[model samples]
Target: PQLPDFIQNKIDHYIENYFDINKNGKHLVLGKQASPDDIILQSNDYLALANHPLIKARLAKSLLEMSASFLQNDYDKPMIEKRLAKFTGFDECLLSQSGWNANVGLLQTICQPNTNVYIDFFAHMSLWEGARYANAQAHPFMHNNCDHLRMLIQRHGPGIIVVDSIYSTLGTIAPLAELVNISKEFGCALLVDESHSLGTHGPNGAGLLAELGLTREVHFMTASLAKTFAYRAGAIWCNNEVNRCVPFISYPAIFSSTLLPYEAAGLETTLEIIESADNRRQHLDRMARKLRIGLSQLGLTIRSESQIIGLETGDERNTEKVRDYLESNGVFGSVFCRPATSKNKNIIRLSLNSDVNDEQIAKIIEVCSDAVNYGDFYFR
Candidate 1:
């Protein structure tokens, strides 16, 4: 908002009128986050390790050993590298301060201003922003359609392919495996955003790419730990090739990365929790099923996913009406509109976390059913 007063006013007005602060800031899974109780109900904390005891223990031990003075020195770099490599079944990995930084940094260091970046029409915003800042010509393919991606890459040769492993707003997962194969056929480098699926999907939580055998085919991996991993750090995964340029040129690493040491401790523990995924994933699966099935029985339209539940409302007003209804009843879920989703397909979004029990999940469904049923009275 460090812009002209008029511009700032417009931005503020737009947010107050349209944006759903609950979707990102405070919600059921992230109860009163950045506030009191900080109870998290809508978070993608699938492994529930935001402040797990084990994580606390590790932080304490790390502080004692190094005064929490961890740096991205040679010794510590390999720790992140190995952790990410093993976690994603990749050859190597690089840690970044944020997922957006990783995505933008990668494009800046690799693509020339004239280079074209072909991405899914519905790829995460970071990818688009990165491509723009890189001064590259950006092209979009139909969402989750590999054929469309192939045609775009074929027509725009020598471009990078970017997409999200799972669409966060709608819980619609991309067929990453197919996209990877198509990118390879076109000799394109594929970058995937696993923000939503990093700790929720795949065998052992390696993400959907590994679950589908697309790990080796993917040229890069970028993730935001604030979601499933329940931390603040981000990661960039690839072979040792990209590491050559990351340390010197990436904006954050060049600026503030050296000053932040606690991120290492926080993210390291997140990886440990993610390594043991069976119990957590099972719990997430159960909750997702309960919500999805229960909502469907109420004759509400629902998407087909266990990690995120999306409810389609006839219009944005209806979506907001239902969202307010849930929030008033002490239940919180995400609401998507405008830039966050194409077609303005107003949806009630839920990021399932294992912390929610069967009873809580059922209550959510019950409230949702009543809200949707009663919402029409306003329209009536």
Candidate 2:
């Protein structure tokens, strides 16, 4: 079969800068298409189910039945919505194409020009973008500081408070109970983004909100199904009042195509798996603790209680040197610097997924221990 001329021209244009991505075990071909079998430690697939048999089969089946529109109102959509609502303890739920879109939609729905938005200084960039889009006056409170939040609220009057349940870079859990109480006492609407928390916490992988029993008390929630659910989508779980407007008024919901049949099926399957995967969660928690303790024993400063671990190196160039050392030694993790945090707060992050093996875990500990030695080599 021959391609249409216009379509061929468009393809030819993009082909000039196209990346040739090829997978090698857990690693991808990085830099000039070079094959590197590096162990991935920066992935957000906490449950390690992105390549699960059931999920792959569903994705293949859905590709065959891919219809773009109206599927958002169909049975598959409602089924996932009901399941998510039940899981998150929200009255209703809406699906978005991505977590970024979901956060923007929720902010648009709840914020007005006259409204004020209080966001954690370390909240995800999407929240900051959403506040800008909503034209709301935004104030930044110190990261996880209830006293600062209280002071901000007292000065700004009633407004909306936005935060991430798990701060991605620092890998710290939010003070949910105190934040929820502050929201109520200050008469503010609270929105929690659980993109990094969902399948990594709670009794049944519900999220931090559920573990702390604050799910119902929070006014809104948004998350990425891609992270732990092993799918590529986002969702917003909200109260009845906000739910009624999302499908009709949210631009992303009203304008974007619905999730594919297979993607929705995959999400549903993962949600069911999450309901009983306590063993995986426990393993992840144990490994995270082991890694943290090992690093602390090596005289490194670390702060995190979840699978996402953070190690502050206090300098930007030193952070990159650590990252390069890990990568060269067949290990891969994230390095945060500059705009992601202050220059003096640069960090090397290790994101642990359940897919990791005992050997890989030991290798990670060894590599991280070796990497920290560079502080004395270069920083001193």
Candidate 3:
């Protein structure tokens, strides 16, 4: 079969660096068994909702009910409407099976051919893909540079400007206020993706937009519910306008199953948790600050907010080596490599969940310190 050059190249790269996972025991070849005993950090279930009894019971009930009712016939699904209303204060919400489709749905509903779109340089691939599917003219501005976006919008006229609330790759918060104001000046609508920040940021974990008081200011929002929301769903939240448009025309809304009952139930629980964000939010803040400061005092390159953290490794070699070192020492983290990241610089991403206590944090510090000193690299 003929393949696109880009696709073939991707295949080649995958074959060169691929590792397969098995239920029995494995990561890459020679990697240790991952199980209850293994320290797992690659997960982004930031609040550890999976273990919450309320979340679990809700999931069980929802799953049983959903199994009895086929989604093709079900409208006004419980979680679909519940989360949609809860997250963005929107009158309407549409759910998709996945996050990528959520963004894809956003583009289909909000954009059309010949429309102009300005994207944050660090906006997730889902946004870019969504714009492409919409056949819009998409251009990327410098990362978090509102002036660049403002100039582009002024030059191009009103359109959609996309940004993420929390940058997963860099572990940085987006300057959303500047983005909203800039977009307004140009008469452009602002769309913020809250995939990484939905669970960890804001008072109710409503995300950085609501946290920063730009909820009413921003025109649109989308999120991956799989992360903090603990649901196998993706959401597009906007005024009644987009929601009405989404259900009928968006690809996922038409073709995808409504979120599974269990996932939806879990999302409901997530909202309830967010309602009492005082304890969770405070704990996450202190832990993130403590780890950031601890790593910084040790001369480690730690970039984090009150939740997510990034360890800059300069390049892939240092990144992989440190990742290996940490995993070997019974700790785990995400190893960011090329292609997924806009830049080739490798990073270690740590999602600081409430479950991570001081003892775990101390162990994390110890592991990181050891890696920084002993991990293989061109320089110390």
Candidate 4:
């Protein structure tokens, strides 16, 4: 059967556009730097541990038996889970393919027909997808507005509230203590996605929940290993009560596969490093603070407690132009517009890796200054 002309035309048009953008030097190539001259501010390697020797050693060793089945007797699944659980303060931890899959699995395991799910308006897309997968009515409250959350739960009754420990785009931290109090008052289950917080916050990278003494209080938590741990994986942490069934019951776990041996080894090795990487954590905090101060001094409206620093752009075209300008000046960043954010609120996001130094930070300030103040571009 032949495809419809209209759909085919659209596809062809998009394909042509993609090439045109690259041909005209507008597209960014994705890979390791071809030259040491390149500067990357978009990567989420917060601890700068991605290139650690321990991780590389484990990865190389695990390759000897590249198994994907978690239930296999030869797999080092138990030790990895136990290590992650001990560090994150969870009774049990289960590895998944990615953060999105973890969220999907957890929500699918817990969401019921009668469940009334409440989420932050700016919650991660994975959480939204989980809500949809569960077939539960998801009510979105205002971003970081506990009052609004209370009002929503008051009207809809208590069930579940989902949020991120550290919002990636806005660079804001969630008020976990207050949120936990509200959830207890409303008799609601709270799920905090600590993807951006793990390996970056708390003592020995225990994450925000541990930092705030609310680790065991939350009903469930999820995280992505890519950001702080510098591995391509995801994990779900819960109490032993729920942990017993979630691994077997979650669709993504049962129907889908587990982490590859090397990936799991990478995570395990990173976990060990994270457990004793207080010096790295302090260095990260110092660098992030310096970057935020630098950006703020340049008159950019930015707020952040972690490695992610975002500057509001407000217009879509302006955001792209700014990113283009930065890239041309040898600095790379992420542009979040439209679906990633509200149509009216676009942002140029900069994530600080521990590897960045004073020189790179200075270059960023200089380039951003030129781009933001460039014609027709302004941060509101």
Tens-digit per-residue lDDT, 17-91, candidate 3: 543322213222233445565456666787777678877787777677632124433464565465556666655
Can you write out model 1's per-residue Cα lDDT over 172-285, one digit (the tens) per residue?
788876776777788888888899888787888888888888888788888887787776667788854886677676666676544145557766777877878679888888
Deviation of model 1 at 271, angstroms? 1.6
- Residue 247's lDDT in candidate 1: 67
TM-score for each model = 0.84, 0.85, 0.85, 0.90
| Candidate number with the higher lDDT (3 or 4) | 4
lDDT of each: 0.72, 0.78, 0.73, 0.80
Candidate 4: lDDT of 205?
87
Candidate No. with top TM-score:
4
Flag regions of model 1 displaced more than 4 Å: 1-40, 64-73, 76-78, 297-299, 314-316, 375-380
Whole-model lDDT for model 2 versus the true structure?
Answer: 0.78
Which residue pairs clash within candidate 1?
28-41, 28-42, 29-40, 29-41, 29-42, 29-43, 30-41, 30-42, 31-39, 31-40
Using lDDT, rank the candidates from best to worst: 4, 2, 3, 1
State model 3's lDDT: 0.73
Task: Choose the strongest candidate by lDDT.
Answer: 4
RMSD of each: 4.8, 6.4, 4.4, 3.1
Model 1 weakest 10-residue run by lDDT: 28-37
- Over 1-380, each residue of candidate 4 has an lDDT whose tens digit, in order, gives 87799999998786665334443434322222324586877788888886788789888888976223347343455578878888888888878888888898889888986689999988899999888888988999988999999999999998889999999897789889999999999999999999888988899889999999998789899998878877777888986567666667777777776665556666777788888988878887888888888788878788676788888887655565666667778887787765677766887788887788888888888887787677747776
Please state the error at residue 161 of candidate 1 in Å.
1.2
